[PDB]
Structure 1
Amino acid sequence: ETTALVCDNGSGLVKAGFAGDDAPRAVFPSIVGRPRHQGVMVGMGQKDSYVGDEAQSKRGILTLKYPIEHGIITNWDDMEKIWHHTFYNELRVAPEEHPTLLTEAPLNPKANREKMTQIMFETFNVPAMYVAIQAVLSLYASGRTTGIVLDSGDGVTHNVPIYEGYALPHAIMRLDLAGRDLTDYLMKILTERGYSFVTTAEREIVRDIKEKLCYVALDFENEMATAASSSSLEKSYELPDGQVITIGNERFRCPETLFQPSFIGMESAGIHETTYNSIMKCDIDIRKDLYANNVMSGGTTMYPGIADRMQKEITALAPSTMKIKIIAPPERKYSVWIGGSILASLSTFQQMWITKQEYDEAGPSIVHRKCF
């Protein structure tokens, strides 16, 4: 045996690599694009579909779409097309030799995990597989046993409280506000400056505006007063046609949707009150250890100043004698993959794989009574 594969399929990026590494060798977006215009040059390399980094380059003529929406895979033809691109075109492996570690969000459909298991054996014919929960793997990456994990990615934000090795599945919150809903609110409030980004190729531009110019205001009602003297507030951004946009208070205002989800019409609470309501559903003897370990992960927790507001605004909810310590590693974008590289290389793990023999005598329903 050489090694094992760790394929972190997310709603926005597909992180992939080998176990035992410290960074994924394969980071490309989870986009499958079909061309939508006519097509008039004969031959000269026109494929029926473009996946990932190729569709990101040719995106002006493509109808881009995501096969994964809010964690749930909705377009199993396109998801088998990304996995085919991930293993062959991007990692250059043989899938019949390496065991594959997959990740998915908690509180997810049963058929979403059975259908991953059916594809990895009946189509790729892997020797073994295992589906892990992402917020469990975010805590191997920090090398811990205790802590609540705020894993906010591109499709789903979810808290999982984990005390000393033991997960508390009744306190797992799942909030479907994520980075893809911050882009779609940003396309709505860039309209009030005048700039109209509508089609799906501009959705990948407003995503790139958000990753470069948006931050989290430490007090939202005071930065809106700073928009009176919009001097250091406004920044510029060069679009791929050469135009510039002067984005102003829309920098700090779209990540406030993480803290006030009523901006996009959701009745639910922000990520500071879904952390606090998930600690307050735990036992009273472990709430001191969950305050002191607030592990953030995922790429939506990469804004400048989001650890400073989570530490500010849980403290206004928690009793004043408990210390709050939001713990943000700088590598926290890939930490679901970093913990998957650790868990697949542990020596105590090689009896937890779902082998091909164990699958065949049990069908696709083996994955529920074996993984979690």
Structure 2
Amino acid sequence: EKTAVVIDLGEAFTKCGFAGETGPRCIIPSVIKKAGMPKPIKVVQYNINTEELYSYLKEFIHILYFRHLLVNPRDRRVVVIESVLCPSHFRETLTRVLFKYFEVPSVLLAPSHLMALLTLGINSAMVLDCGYRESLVLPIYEGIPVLNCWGALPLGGKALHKELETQLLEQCTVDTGQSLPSVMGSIPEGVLEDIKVRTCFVSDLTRGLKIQAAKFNRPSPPPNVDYPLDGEKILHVLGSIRDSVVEILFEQDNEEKSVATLILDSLMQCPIDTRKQLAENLVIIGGTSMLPGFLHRLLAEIRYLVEKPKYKKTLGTKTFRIHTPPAKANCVAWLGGAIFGALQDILGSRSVSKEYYNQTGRIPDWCSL
């Protein structure tokens, strides 16, 4: 009858396509290309002028639906996959742009973790979404997301970018156009993403502990490979640096916090009957989880933290299984929204319509009244 639209906005990338198709049609990055502009500006931003955001969202949606969808969304429904705890200011702006400017029939602002759970096809699961800005945890038990049990450290893609920028600046080796360290003050983000995808090798638990021991009073430094760059300035990036950048994601000491500890804190907050099913079904999604050799380092670190005396008195013996999804780790949240929209013309009714928005005021966020 009518295949609905699926959107999954974010600061780094944006998964978008049709509901029903196994995986999206395209994934253009969040930034936009403007005429007479030095650098490309990011679309998804927080704490900034309302009318400017509205114009930025219109500009991104306009370049999206022609290239991605090849259709007017005026014919059929939309599924805007907002991550839970995405600012209400930003949701209101999205609601305005979809109804006032474009005039869609319906919209939906559903959470990312519940839809990622629909892909697995199980009702209870602990979920971790390691995106660009934050690494958010949220356990779901029998459909309902357990909200007060949660956690989100500023330790996703953006933290890894900042650490790469710091460590490369400290130890730099650029070719002539050899020596000459710290010539350029900063480096672009698109290049630094390509370095993370290709170079950064994720270490094991025993290797990670050896690196942590070396930092505070050297084993397994290799391997190292150079990275090519434009304008005839190749830089000889090292092997110990990229491993040290990955290590800060799992660094426990002096914060009592990490990607692994965040699941345990979420499990601690959850009730006793819910506890065991969440431990059995531990789902990992998001952008940072696509890194090579990540799921072992997490599961081994999780287990090491359970062996510690502080978590034995509550958790103890637990079968931590990581049931992986059908689609890739970044594109699990989108696939869930595509499942939610395509199949059920019935569950399209619960979402907010154009008729309801004009008279009322806004889509209902999880708040009072």
Q: For residue 321 of structure 1, what is the aligned residue in structure 2?
A: 317
One-letter amino acid of the structure 2 residue matched with residue 20 of structure 1 = G
Which one of the candidate residues 334, 337, 347 is aligned to 1:349?
Answer: 347
Shift of 1:255: 2.2
Which one of the candidate residues 240, 246, 250 is aligned to 2:241?
Answer: 250
2:17 and 2:68 in contact (8 A); partners too: no
Query: 1:9-53 deviations in whole A, cap 9, x for unaligned?
Result: 11111111000011111201111244xxxxxxxxxxxx456xxxx
Query: 1:126-164 deviations in whole A, cap 9, x for unaligned?
Result: 100001111112111222211111001112211110011
1:261 and 1:268 in contact (8 A); partners too: yes
Distance in 1 (CA, whole Å) between partners of 2:96 and 2:108 is 12
1:17 and 1:25 in contact (8 A); partners too: yes
2:5 and 2:73 in contact (8 A); partners too: no
Distance in 1 (CA, whole Å) between partners of 2:347 and 2:27 is 26
Distance in 2 (CA, whole Å) between partners of 1:303 and 1:18 is 27
Q: Which has the higher strand share?
A: 1
Change (3 A) 1:235 1:69: farther
SS at match of 2:266: helix
SS at match of 1:137: helix
Shift of 1:341: 0.6
Change (3 A) 1:70 1:12: farther
Change (3 A) 1:72 1:153: farther
Q: For residue 190 of structure 2, what is the aligned residue in structure 1?
A: 204
One-letter amino acid of the structure 2 residue matched with residue 4 of structure 1 = A
Which one of the candidate residues 21, 25, 39 is aligned to 1:63?
Answer: 39
Distance in 2 (CA, whole Å) between partners of 1:122 and 1:268 is 46
One-letter amino acid of the structure 2 residue matched with residue 335 of structure 1 = V
Change (3 A) 1:70 1:148: farther
Change (3 A) 1:368 1:14: same
1:23 and 1:338 in contact (8 A); partners too: yes
| Residue 119 (1) aligns with residue 97 (2) | yes
Query: 1:67-101 deviations in whole A, cap 9, x for unaligned?
Result: 32479998513232111111123322112112111
Distance in 2 (CA, whole Å) between partners of 1:119 and 1:102 is 12
| Residue 222 (1) aligns with residue 213 (2) | no
Which one of the candidate residues 236, 240, 249 is aligned to 2:226?
Answer: 236
Question: Which blocks of at least 5 consecutive residues in structure 2 are unaligned?
Answer: 174-181, 307-311
Shift of 1:269: 1.5
Give the paired residue count: 341
1:307 and 1:327 in contact (8 A); partners too: no
Distance in 1 (CA, whole Å) between partners of 2:295 and 2:49 is 30
Distance in 2 (CA, whole Å) between partners of 1:272 and 1:251 is 20
220-229 or 148-157, larger mean C-alpha shift:
220-229
Change (3 A) 1:359 1:253: same
2:14 and 2:29 in contact (8 A); partners too: yes
Change (3 A) 1:323 1:73: farther
Which one of the candidate residues 335, 338, 352 is aligned to 2:332?
Answer: 335
Q: For residue 41 of structure 1, what is the aligned residue in structure 2?
A: none
1:73 and 1:112 in contact (8 A); partners too: no
Shift of 1:256: 2.1
SS at match of 1:190: helix
1:30 and 1:67 in contact (8 A); partners too: yes
Q: For residue 309 of structure 2, what is the aligned residue in structure 1?
A: none
2:119 and 2:339 in contact (8 A); partners too: yes
Matches within 5 A, 1:103-182: 103-182=81-160
Q: How does the TM-score come out when normalised to structure 2?
A: 0.84
SS at match of 2:305: coil
Identity %: 29
65-74 or 275-284, larger mean C-alpha shift:
65-74
Shift of 1:363: 1.3
Question: Which blocks of at least 5 consecutive residues in structure 1 are unaligned?
Answer: 35-46, 50-61
Q: How does the TM-score come out when normalised to structure 1?
A: 0.83
SS at match of 1:120: helix
